[PDB]
Scaffold this active site. Structure first.
Site, PDB file in Angstrom:
ATOM      1  N   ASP A   1       0.789  -1.268  -0.127  1.00  0.00           N
ATOM      2  CA  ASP A   1      -0.018  -0.012  -0.056  1.00  0.00           C
ATOM      3  C   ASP A   1       0.901   1.141  -0.110  1.00  0.00           C
ATOM      4  O   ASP A   1       0.337   2.496   0.487  1.00  0.00           O
ATOM      5  CB  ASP A   1      -0.992  -0.073   1.316  1.00  0.00           C
ATOM      6  CG  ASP A   1       0.002  -0.528   2.419  1.00  0.00           C
ATOM      7  OD1 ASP A   1       1.189  -0.252   2.600  1.00  0.00           O
ATOM      8  OD2 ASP A   1      -0.834  -1.172   3.411  1.00  0.00           O
TER       9      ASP A   1
ATOM     10  N   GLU B   1       0.631  -8.842  -1.793  1.00  0.00           N
ATOM     11  CA  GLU B   1       0.321  -8.408  -0.721  1.00  0.00           C
ATOM     12  C   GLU B   1      -0.977  -7.530  -0.999  1.00  0.00           C
ATOM     13  O   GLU B   1      -1.174  -6.443  -0.723  1.00  0.00           O
ATOM     14  CB  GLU B   1       1.166  -7.506   0.365  1.00  0.00           C
ATOM     15  CG  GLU B   1       0.359  -7.442   1.777  1.00  0.00           C
ATOM     16  CD  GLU B   1       1.267  -6.667   2.580  1.00  0.00           C
ATOM     17  OE1 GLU B   1       0.990  -5.358   2.938  1.00  0.00           O
ATOM     18  OE2 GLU B   1       2.147  -7.262   3.359  1.00  0.00           O
TER      19      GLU B   1
ATOM     20  N   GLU C   1      -2.572   4.810   2.717  1.00  0.00           N
ATOM     21  CA  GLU C   1      -2.255   3.384   2.695  1.00  0.00           C
ATOM     22  C   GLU C   1      -3.768   2.817   2.189  1.00  0.00           C
ATOM     23  O   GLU C   1      -3.490   1.804   1.369  1.00  0.00           O
ATOM     24  CB  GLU C   1      -1.547   2.694   3.619  1.00  0.00           C
ATOM     25  CG  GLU C   1      -0.001   3.025   3.642  1.00  0.00           C
ATOM     26  CD  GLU C   1       0.177   4.437   4.331  1.00  0.00           C
ATOM     27  OE1 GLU C   1      -0.742   5.135   4.938  1.00  0.00           O
ATOM     28  OE2 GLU C   1       1.330   4.932   4.318  1.00  0.00           O
TER      29      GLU C   1
ATOM     30  N   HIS D   1       5.993   0.081  19.210  1.00  0.00           N
ATOM     31  CA  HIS D   1       6.047   1.474  18.758  1.00  0.00           C
ATOM     32  C   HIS D   1       4.583   2.256  18.211  1.00  0.00           C
ATOM     33  O   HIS D   1       4.772   3.190  17.637  1.00  0.00           O
ATOM     34  CB  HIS D   1       6.689   1.062  17.313  1.00  0.00           C
ATOM     35  CG  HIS D   1       8.240   0.590  17.360  1.00  0.00           C
ATOM     36  ND1 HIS D   1       9.241   1.452  17.371  1.00  0.00           N
ATOM     37  CD2 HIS D   1       8.699  -0.692  17.785  1.00  0.00           C
ATOM     38  CE1 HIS D   1      10.321   0.887  17.589  1.00  0.00           C
ATOM     39  NE2 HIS D   1      10.171  -0.716  18.027  1.00  0.00           N
TER      40      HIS D   1
ATOM     41  N   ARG E   1       1.846   4.577  18.897  1.00  0.00           N
ATOM     42  CA  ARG E   1       1.450   5.726  19.537  1.00  0.00           C
ATOM     43  C   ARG E   1       0.599   5.545  21.028  1.00  0.00           C
ATOM     44  O   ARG E   1       1.068   6.071  21.977  1.00  0.00           O
ATOM     45  CB  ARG E   1       0.864   6.812  18.680  1.00  0.00           C
ATOM     46  CG  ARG E   1       0.457   8.221  19.510  1.00  0.00           C
ATOM     47  CD  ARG E   1       0.047   9.057  18.513  1.00  0.00           C
ATOM     48  NE  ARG E   1       0.894   9.513  17.424  1.00  0.00           N
ATOM     49  CZ  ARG E   1       1.876  10.147  17.482  1.00  0.00           C
ATOM     50  NH1 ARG E   1       2.187  10.910  18.517  1.00  0.00           N
ATOM     51  NH2 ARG E   1       2.262  10.455  16.321  1.00  0.00           N
TER      52      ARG E   1
ATOM     53  N   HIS F   1      12.952   2.494  22.424  1.00  0.00           N
ATOM     54  CA  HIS F   1      12.266   3.476  21.249  1.00  0.00           C
ATOM     55  C   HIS F   1      13.447   4.677  21.624  1.00  0.00           C
ATOM     56  O   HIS F   1      13.902   4.876  22.333  1.00  0.00           O
ATOM     57  CB  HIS F   1      10.915   3.522  21.696  1.00  0.00           C
ATOM     58  CG  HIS F   1      10.107   4.195  20.523  1.00  0.00           C
ATOM     59  ND1 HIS F   1      10.335   5.765  20.793  1.00  0.00           N
ATOM     60  CD2 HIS F   1       9.519   3.875  19.500  1.00  0.00           C
ATOM     61  CE1 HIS F   1       9.400   6.268  19.547  1.00  0.00           C
ATOM     62  NE2 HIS F   1       9.050   5.124  18.876  1.00  0.00           N
TER      63      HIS F   1
END
Length: 372
Positions: free
Chosen positions: A92, A114, A128, A201, A203, A234
């Site tokens: 995407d 995909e 996407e 990762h 948010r 991170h």
């Protein structure tokens, strides 16, 4: 006359997911001619020993409209000249959609690796979801990673004869990214200890829940002395500060810098279990037979849950501990997940994709869908 396949990739993750397909094409040179076009990852190509044929330097304060036009005009020209029989775009990304469109303008067959993931929300993810939907209308052949993705395509009225559930090529990638005898001090000093790997990762999780989650794994490590925790920290300073404060100063907890997707696959291989909120890891870890505890309240991977390769446990500290201990103390529960069939692929999606392409051009046996 060969089937000239032009594989286009523009990001490191695409590179990893398309490389195996390129390798597969290169294993059958009597049939295929492979042209690799980059529109950005040279570390990944070196691993797969892939010499890119064309490298378009598309640039980086550019708007979405500009990126699209640059890639489309670039690919239009590359396709017009190379005159491939088929162009393969992946997933995407904007690069894939743009290249897809140039492929259509050039009246070349378009294959979508995909194919068919959908949230049905045009603005989430953006762009996407729209990318994969647009690519989906232009595509002549769809290589879906799952039965669900196929159904999505069917619901939009796509021709069943053009869709193939092939599994996810990311799993095929593990055959190459995972080294025979990988090298890393922590893995070498591991001994008889059970490696627990953690990554977060999203948010939503990097926020306030992060503290409860680190405290959870700290407690898992203290409660079970034959375990070790590896946490690629991170880059967010507030997150690191919480990690150092809670996970720092423990001989069995390793706070390292973010690992490359490749180093990560190698850690993953020796891992006993992994906590993550990453989509890729939910599909790849079970490829290694590594049980996955998903740090999310929701998921786009229901297959993994239904198959048993994954467990959606949220971010509540008590649930992290319980679920972790369960897996650590009950070998039966571990092997149950460890041996559960990965619904996202068996590592041969590339072969099914090629057979699918051969099927169209040489009209040889139509490959059957990947059976989950």
């Amino acid at each position: 006359a060969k089937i000239k396949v032009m594989s286009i990739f523009g990001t490191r993750p695409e590179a990893i997911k398309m490389a195996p397909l390129v390798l597969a094409l290169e294993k059958e040179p009597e049939t295929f001619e492979s042209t690799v076009v980059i529109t950005a990852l040279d570390q990944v190509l070196e691993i797969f020993d892939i010499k890119p044929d064309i490298d378009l330097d598309i640039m980086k304060g550019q708007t979405l409209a500009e990126i699209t036009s640059r890639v489309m005009n670039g690919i239009n020209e590359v396709i017009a000249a190379e005159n491939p029989d088929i162009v393969l775009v992946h997933g995407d990304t904007t690069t894939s959609f743009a290249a897809g469109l140039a492929t259509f303008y050039q009246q070349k067959m378009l294959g979508h690796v995909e194919a068919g993931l959908r949230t049905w929300n045009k603005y989430s993810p953006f762009p996407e979801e729209m990318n994969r939907q647009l690519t989906g209308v232009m595509a002549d052949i769809h290589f879906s990673p799952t039965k669900q993705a196929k159904e999505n395509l069917l619901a939009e009225g796509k021709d069943p004869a053009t869709i193939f559930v092939t599994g996810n090529t990311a799993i095929d990638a593990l055959k190459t990214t995972v080294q025979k005898d990988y090298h890393h001090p922590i893995l070498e000093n591991l001994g008889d200890n059970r490696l627990i790997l953690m990554t977060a990762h999203r948010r939503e999780n990097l926020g306030e829940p992060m503290q409860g989650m680190f405290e959870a794994v700290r407690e898992i490590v203290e409660s079970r002395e034959d375990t070790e925790l590896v946490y690629p920290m991170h880059l967010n300073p507030a997150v690191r500060e919480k990690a150092m404060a809670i996970l720092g100063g423990h001989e069995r907890i390793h706070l390292i810098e973010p690992l490359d997707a490749i180093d990560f696959h190698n850690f993953l291989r020796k891992s006993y279990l992994v906590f993550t909120d990453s989509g890729g890891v939910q599909e790849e870890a079970p490829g290694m037979g590594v049980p996955v505890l998903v740090l999310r309240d929701t998921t786009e991977r229901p297959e993994g849950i239904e198959a048993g390769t994954l467990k959606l446990i949220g971010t509540n500290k008590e649930n992290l501990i319980k679920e972790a201990l369960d897996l650590l103390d009950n070998k039966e529960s571990h092997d149950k997940m460890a041996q559960a069939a990965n619904p996202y692929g068996d590592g041969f999606a590339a072969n099914r994709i090629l057979a699918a392409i051969k099927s169209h051009f040489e009209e040889t046996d139509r490959p059957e869908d990947f059976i989950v």
